Design a binder for this molecule. Structure first.
Ligand SMILES: [Cl-]
Ligand SMILES: [Cl-]
Ligand SMILES: [Cl-]
Ligand SMILES: [Cl-]
Ligand SMILES: [Cl-]
Ligand SMILES: [Cl-]
Ligand SMILES: [Cl-]
Ligand SMILES: [Cl-]
Ligand code: NA
Length: 129
C-alpha cells in the first residue's frame, strides 16, 4: 500500500506514534517519506546482507526475522514480511522498540540526514488529525 501523506500521519497517530519518545508526528512522516516514499511494500538489501522492510525500512540485522540474515536477531519478534502489510501496526510497534534503543530516531540514518533539524511540521501541515 502506498499511503497518502495525511493518511499515514493519521494512521501513525491512531497507533500512538505521535510524540512517542518525544518525536512529533512530522518526524515520523518525514522518516517514512525518505525511507519508503510511504510504500509499505518497500524492501532494500544492505551491503552486509541484511534487508530493510516496510514504511520505516526496519532492518533484519536486529529487528525482524527473514531467515537469510546470518547472526542476526529478531528483537521485535516478528517475521520481516509482517512489516510489509497494508496495516502498519507491526511497523509501528517495532519502530517504538527501535526508537527506544538509546539513539532515538538517529537509528534511521535517513532521518538524521534528511529530517533532523528541519521543519518537520511541514509533513503534517494541513492534515485533519
Ligand atoms: Cl509527500
Ligand atoms: Cl510535527
Ligand atoms: Cl536470519
Ligand atoms: Cl534470498
Ligand atoms: Cl532475537
Ligand atoms: Cl519468523
Ligand atoms: Cl494502518
Ligand atoms: Cl531522543
Ligand atoms: Na533477523
Amino acid at each position: 500500500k502506498v499511503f497518502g501523506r495525511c493518511e499515514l500521519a493519521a494512521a501513525m497517530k491512531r497507533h500512538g506514534l505521535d510524540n512517542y519518545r518525544g518525536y512529533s508526528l512530522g518526524n515520523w512522516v518525514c522518516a517514512a517519506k525518505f525511507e519508503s516514499n510511504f510504500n509499505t511494500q518497500a524492501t532494500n538489501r544492505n551491503t552486509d546482507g541484511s534487508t530493510d522492510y516496510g514504511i520505516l525500512q526496519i532492518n533484519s540485522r536486529w529487528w525482524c526475522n527473514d531467515g537469510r540474515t546470518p547472526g542476526s536477531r529478531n528483537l521485535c519478534n516478528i517475521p520481516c514480511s509482517a512489516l510489509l502489510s497494508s496495516d502498519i501496526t507491526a511497523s509501528v510497534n517495532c519502530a517504538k522498540k527501535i526508537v527506544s534503543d538509546g539513539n532515538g530516531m538517529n537509528a534511521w540514518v535517513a532521518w538524521r540526514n534528511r529530517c533532523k533539524g528541519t521543519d518537520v511540521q511541514a509533513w503534517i501541515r494541513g492534515c485533519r488529525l
